[PDB]
Design a protein around this ligand. Structure first.
Ligand SMILES: [Ba+2]
Ligand SMILES: [Ba+2]
Ligand SMILES: [Ba+2]
Ligand SMILES: [Ba+2]
Ligand SMILES: [Ba+2]
Ligand SMILES: [Ba+2]
Ligand SMILES: [Ba+2]
Ligand SMILES: [Ba+2]
Ligand SMILES: [Ba+2]
Ligand SMILES: [Ba+2]
Ligand SMILES: [Cl-]
Ligand SMILES: [Cl-]
Ligand SMILES: [Cl-]
Ligand SMILES: [Cl-]
Lengths: 104, 104
């Protein structure tokens, strides 16, 4: 529980941080780097993006509990967004909502 | 071996990325965020910074092998730099050398 959640939290936080402090002119280039080089796909999150939860198997819900405690109670953790499989974790910068998608 | 190394690689890569694409005016502020919020201390690496290897115990050398395969053959991995304990991993942006220090 704790260990997996800690790693996922670290990834989301470092990714959000990279975006937060990014040179606005290089922000699109940064998103390409994160995806290709770090395997981290960032997307804007639209209010109408649909999602499906990870199953209640193994320690998923405990992992999810620990992630929200560290990232924020309103964090969405999902196994798909708009029918696209992955490990999906939402985050925010100010008024802007985002997804991070990782490979399962 | 693989798993620990993969996580450390991810941290170093995301950290380097954040720095690489950072707004130059916010770069010092970014370093504060990484340290306080992500527990990642970045330092410039000076050619005369001394270091001490992690012991050859457990799977340390295998972890180190996997880290270098992903980050670069010239990567230094150390248990201390200038007598300061931690998990230290070097990285570069162009001509500039850096350390990342994590808690053990
Ligand atoms: Ba909290
Ligand atoms: Ba919003
Ligand atoms: Ba809002
Ligand atoms: Ba809202
Ligand atoms: Ba919004
Ligand atoms: Ba290589
Ligand atoms: Ba140099
Ligand atoms: Ba050099
Ligand atoms: Ba050199
Ligand atoms: Ba140098
Ligand atoms: Cl953008
Ligand atoms: Cl979905
Ligand atoms: Cl600087
Ligand atoms: Cl040392």
């Amino acid at each position: 529980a704790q260990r997996v959640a800690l790693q996922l939290v670290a990834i989301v936080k470092l990714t959000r941080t990279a975006l937060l402090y990014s040179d606005p002119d290089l922000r699109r280039a940064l998103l390409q780097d994160l995806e290709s080089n770090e395997g981290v796909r960032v997307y804007p999150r639209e209010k109408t993006d649909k999602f499906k939860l990870q199953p209640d198997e193994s320690v998923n819900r405990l992992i999810e509990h620990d992630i929200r405690s560290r990232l924020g109670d309103d964090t969405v953790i999902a196994q798909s967004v708009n029918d696209i499989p992955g490990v999906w974790i939402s985050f925010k910068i100010d008024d802007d909502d985002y997804w991070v998608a990782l490979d399962r």
